[PDB]
């Protein structure tokens, strides 16, 4: 969770709406086990 | 140095010696001759079961014995050679007829379905091993007929097939076995695939947090570190082949390691995942006799 | 010389005059999770004096027709002391235990208790329904009794299908009212994972079964209580966050 | 490799605005800005990143992760945030 | 190179981009009570990861006409986390603290906060009654505010008679909205006894006074909050018994 | 060895170097000559009070100075010689007349009763010292008259006298001073008698546990490690000697050690044990001027 | 904005213990990732009378 520690203080004539980009990644001790068919793709008929 | 109650125990909390060293025992133990001993104060027969230790009164200390170079073997008692024999695990029924327009069968991998092997592998609480699976496949009558079959392994997470010719059967990543019905049984080797360090057949606890009911506590004991996926089977075809098929699965446990033995179950089984029984019919382990002092 | 004994852990001590032995379960002492077996990367916490001490549960009155009791660990110590607070604030818990059960009686009473530990004491639902959707399952309070401890319904099968006769393969000890008056068992951390949760999974359970029923002549003392006391040894906690009771 | 996280995956948030969590001057303190579960195999934000689309080709994962938060606000606008990862237990916290 | 800074304690970390220094109070680090100064014979407990971390209190909104706030230590951490539980279960408590107060503002706002620590911050009753039987004394909630923290009534005298001008002799630090945005202070255990209670006597108090009032032009952000975060360092507890809240 | 996160910090938590070493300074600091320095990047005048550190811009770095072998003394600034001067502490009024049939006076030992010395010894928070008490005793008019007096010290716990000739005055164990009214003042030396390791004049806390009210919190701040007993005074006689007597007590603080300095109080005192004041009349430390840019 | 991913490891952020990680990474190499056969194409040979 990302909470407002204090606030988003801004001077005059500056937009009060900003954005934050969240990026994710794995650390250096990341490892994986048995393979598996992904569930993010679907196909009904052959791609002709 | 300034405060030393913190160093006195840090350098004292190393591996504490718990000597229970075993030795390589090839054959059963022999015996040594013994004469009669009329001595006071040294009693090997008087024991005390309240110490939690079993009696150590051997033969030589109780009766006058001869010596015997016992050459009997003990190799067939090791758990390796005890679980080295394959047994039935699960059977699937694939009715690819005209009235059953499904075409595929699905089996949740769970060896707790058949008592013969469950009773053995439940005498130990924590087991770690590699399995050797063998699939025999016949018709309902027991006939073999040259129809090619596909067995797919669906690990936890992968999409399960939805039809006879669905795309999941492409098995681009899932391991799969194509074999004809008129061929030797299909045999593969599967490793120790649990996320934990050992399979446990008894998990005294719940999988998740939260409030747990008291009427239908259907989630108690079900450990996820045991469920290892799914086994799907189909016949490789575009239209239905009208036949009733039956696939039996046998598993051999090799490179076995067992931990924390357990009493062997006496009451019959009633459920697969749960160790249920019935308090109305308690089957005593010992058969009944007429009298106590009348050994039959 | 061997009947007398004194255990001491933290700020607590236990004396005993008639108990004769200390059953070390499976011949291994409770130790810390070595680095070659640890999986959590964070640094755990080791109080070792706030939690490592003898907590004394309530007493259970042994009746002439009692049926036995069972406790779950570390379920009992989840609301008492700094152990309870650490277990409610931390996600990963690891510890061995030292059990000590006392049931004293005059030299005219007779009876025998079996005091054992059952690693992964999964209870069972007593009912002949074979469909998994209508079968009876033990309620939450029946499987995690808490500090109060629960009683058996048919101890001959240990409420788990298995017979009580073979239960002697477990780390056990008798309380025979003619020789000893208390039984003690030092059990290490028995689990298939380095650490585990302390509010979901109970490593083992304690079993006290009156095998030889209590018997006494008239005039003697009728109220014969049983008291259990537990000492978590070499305890570690990890994964700190807000307090979750269950 | 770092890859963006569809953490603003709400309805009525079509387009590239899914990759942006908004930040605004709050009149009430101790207020929540965003939240998401840290299970890459789960559906949600991680379903967009690379680690989360490649952890679905395997069954079991292990190891730590990291989450980089880049601020795209103005230069004169300042602030402080509190990023808190809570191990399993109850649901997400109510207050900070 | 000196503006950026990162503190890390336990499982928590704090970054900062504009604060430039770490005020070590009285030039001494928090350390454990050496054996040559200890009086309690029992063995204390030292978690060092369950309690040693950054607890973030609630935020106080700096208004144009605010008057300042004060906290008492370790009063604030008596109901939160394992620190709260250890302090409620143990009689003898010892620990240093690491304070960190953040109040960020744009480069157009102006103002200055004085962030200081007052060892033994005895408050005073504001009233001209000279007889000790009718004189006004500060209530319990006014002297031990808790996690909420209390506000001043006349900060020019620090509610303790002494003037605020000389309060700079204390371990202090400014928050000047033109240079820095947070102030941090590492204070050791300051007391006349090796250990002391954690629910009766508060070793010191934190003071945040808006000396130069907040001033900004129209259109800027009006809600300028102040957030304090505390890390008990090198903590020890002793004298374990039942839980006493106060 | 098996687990080393526990040893890596145990052998790293020794005394951490906090170097702030002082030096023996006999006299005030001199100065060294300095020319003009026209250099960029090296600015001793630009400071930053926000760091909590005081400015270190000395004289040589700012203006061109000569050298001076400063021989001024600094010995009269040490706290030893600052508290080495006795001051009034308490005064008791013994009216042994016919209408006052008590005969003895009692004084709770509390030096916080007279502002002159309280203001000094309250600029430091923790003090540890040995006291040197001196008792002058006169009549109400200031006369001396040959009447023998007895001063008894009643530590916390001992029974306080109940009459002019009660048994408590036997002082079999309590220290006592017998002296005539026409003799030099009685002077004794008292050690550091607190149970704690130092006297504290400010104790931000309560003495006991329990629920603390919000209307009359008369117990806040009162530390018991300060109260050091009682001082009883009588005139050695069986019948009343009709005279008004007044005993003044002066204390010298020797072998002093002070800790954690404190701002010196500005508002007047109102209570002995409590640091009360009045918000209605806040006496500002600086006198008022006409304008700001009009230094008088 | 430097185009480089964060290098903040665990030891530099929170207080960690030491762990002799024995987990395997062999099943992540592309060799063992593509070493599993999958369907590529299917042909339909209708050698009937029509
Ligand atoms: C294409 C090959 C398909 C056959 C291979 C399927 C994978 C077999 C995985 C077996 C997992 C270990 C053995 C199973 C143990 C128990 O059934 C579970 N712990 C729960 O009962
Ligand atoms: C027969 C000799 C009688 C005179 C000697 C009486 C004992 C004096 C004890 C003095 C104790 C230290 C000085 C007192 C300090 C403060 O008054 C207390 N901390 C409270 O105010």
UniProtKB/TrEMBL annotation, chains C, E:
Coiled coil: none annotated. It is found in: Host cytoplasmic vesicle membrane; Host nucleus; Virion. RNA-directed RNA polymerase: Replicates the viral genomic RNA on the surface of intracellular membranes. May form linear arrays of subunits that propagate along a strong head-to-tail interaction called interface-I. Covalently attaches UMP to a tyrosine of VPg, which is used to prime RNA synthesis. The positive stranded RNA genome is first replicated at virus induced membranous vesicles, creating a dsRNA genomic replication form. This dsRNA is then used as template to synthesize positive stranded RNA genomes. ss(+)RNA genomes are either translated, replicated or encapsidated. Belongs to the picornaviruses polyprotein family. Homodimer. Interacts with host GBF1. Interacts (via GOLD domain) with host ACBD3 (via GOLD domain); this interaction allows the formation of a viral protein 3A/ACBD3 heterotetramer with a 2:2 stoichiometry, which will stimulate the recruitment of host PI4KB in order to synthesize PI4P at the viral RNA replication sites. This is Genome polyprotein. The chain holds residues 79 to 324 of 2193 of the full protein.
TrEMBL record, chain D:
It comes from the Viruses. It is found in: Host cytoplasmic vesicle membrane; Host nucleus; Virion. Belongs to the picornaviruses polyprotein family. RNA-directed RNA polymerase: Replicates the viral genomic RNA on the surface of intracellular membranes. May form linear arrays of subunits that propagate along a strong head-to-tail interaction called interface-I. Covalently attaches UMP to a tyrosine of VPg, which is used to prime RNA synthesis. The positive stranded RNA genome is first replicated at virus induced membranous vesicles, creating a dsRNA genomic replication form. This dsRNA is then used as template to synthesize positive stranded RNA genomes. ss(+)RNA genomes are either translated, replicated or encapsidated. Homodimer. Interacts with host GBF1. Interacts (via GOLD domain) with host ACBD3 (via GOLD domain); this interaction allows the formation of a viral protein 3A/ACBD3 heterotetramer with a 2:2 stoichiometry, which will stimulate the recruitment of host PI4KB in order to synthesize PI4P at the viral RNA replication sites. This is Genome polyprotein. It comes from Coxsackievirus A10. The chain holds residues 373 to 468 of 2193 of the full protein.
């Amino acid at each position: 969770t990302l909470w407002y520690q204090t606030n988003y203080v801004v001077p005059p004539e500056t937009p009060g709406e900003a954005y934050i980009i969240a990026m994710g990644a794995a650390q250096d001790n990341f490892t994986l086990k048995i393979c598996k068919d992904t569930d993010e793709v679907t196909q009904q008929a052959v791609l002709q | 140095d300034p405060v030393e109650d913190i160093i006195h125990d840090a350098l004292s909390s190393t591996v504490r010696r718990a000597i229970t060293s075993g030795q390589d025992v090839n054959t059963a133990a022999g015996t040594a001759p013994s004469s009669h001993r009329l001595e006071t104060g040294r009693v090997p027969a008087l024991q005390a079961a309240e110490t939690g230790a079993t009696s150590n009164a051997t033969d030589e200390n109780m009766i006058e014995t001869r010596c015997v170079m016992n050459r009997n073997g003990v190799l067939e008692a090791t758990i390796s050679h005890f679980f080295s024999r394959s047994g039935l695990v699960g059977v699937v029924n694939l009715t690819d007829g005209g009235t059953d327009t499904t075409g595929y069968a699905v089996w949740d991998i769970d060896i707790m379905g058949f008592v013969q092997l469950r009773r053995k592998c439940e005498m130990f609480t924590y087991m770690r091993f590699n399995a050797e699976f063998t699939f025999v496949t016949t018709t309902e009558n027991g006939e073999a007929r040259p129809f090619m079959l596909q067995y797919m392994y669906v690990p936890p997470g992968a999409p399960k097939p939805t039809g006879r010719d669905a795309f999941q059967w492409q098995t681009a990543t899932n391991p799969s076995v194509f074999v004809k019905l008129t061929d030797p049984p299909a045999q593969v080797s599967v490793p120790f695939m649990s996320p934990a360090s050992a399979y446990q057949w008894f998990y005294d606890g719940y999988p998740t947090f939260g409030q747990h009911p008291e009427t239908s506590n259907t989630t108690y004991g079900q450990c996820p570190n045991n469920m290892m996926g799914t086994f799907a089977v189909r016949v490789v075809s575009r239209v239905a082949s009208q036949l009733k098929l039956q696939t039996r699965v046998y598993m051999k446990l090799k490179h076995v390691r067992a931990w924390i033995p357990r009493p062997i179950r006496s009451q019959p089984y009633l459920l697969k995942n749960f160790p249920n029984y019935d308090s109305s019919k308690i089957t005593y382990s010992a058969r009944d006799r007429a009298s106590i002092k009348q050994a039959n | 010389s061997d009947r007398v004994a004194q255990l001491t852990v933290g700020n607590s001590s236990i004396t005993t005059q008639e108990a004769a032995n200390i059953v070390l379960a499976y011949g291994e002492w409770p130790e810390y999770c070595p680095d070659t077996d640890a999986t959590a990367v964070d640094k755990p916490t080791r109080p070792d004096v706030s939690v490592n001490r003898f907590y004394t549960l309530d007493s259970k009155m042994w009746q002439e027709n009692s049926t036995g009791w069972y406790w779950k660990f570390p379920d009992v110590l989840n609301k008492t002391g700094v152990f309870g607070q650490n277990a409610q604030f931390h996600y990963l818990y690891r510890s061995g235990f030292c059990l000590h059960v006392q049931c004293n009686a005059s030299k005219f009473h007779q009876g025998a208790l079996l005091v054992a530990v059952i690693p992964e004491f999964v209870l069972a639902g007593r009912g002949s329904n074979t469909k998994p959707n209508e079968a009876p399952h033990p309620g939450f309070n029946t499987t995690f009794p808490g500090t109060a401890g629960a009683s058996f319904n048919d101890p001959y099968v240990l409420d788990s299908g298995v017979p009580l006769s073979q239960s002697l393969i477990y780390p056990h000890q008798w309380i025979n009212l003619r020789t000893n008056n208390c039984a003690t068992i030092i059990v290490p951390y028995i689990n298939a994972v380095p650490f585990d949760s302390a509010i979901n999974h109970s490593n083992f359970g304690l079993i006290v079964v009156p095998v030889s029923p209590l018997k006494y002549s008239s005039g003697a003392t009728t109220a014969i209580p049983i008291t259990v006391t537990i000492a978590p040894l070499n305890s570690e906690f990890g994964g700190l966050r807000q307090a979750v009771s269950q | 490799v770092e890859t963006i996280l569809e953490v603003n995956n709400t309805t009525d948030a079509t387009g590239l605005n899914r990759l942006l969590i908004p930040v605004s001057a709050q009149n009430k303190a101790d207020e929540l800005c965003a939240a998401f579960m840290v299970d890459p195999g789960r559906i949600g934000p991680w379903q967009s990143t690379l680690v989360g689309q490649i952890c679905r080709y395997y069954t079991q994962w292990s190891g730590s992760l990291k989450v980089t938060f880049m601020f795209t606000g103005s230069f004169m606008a300042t602030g402080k945030m509190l990023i808190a990862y809570s191990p399993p237990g109850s649901a997400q916290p109510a207050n900070r």
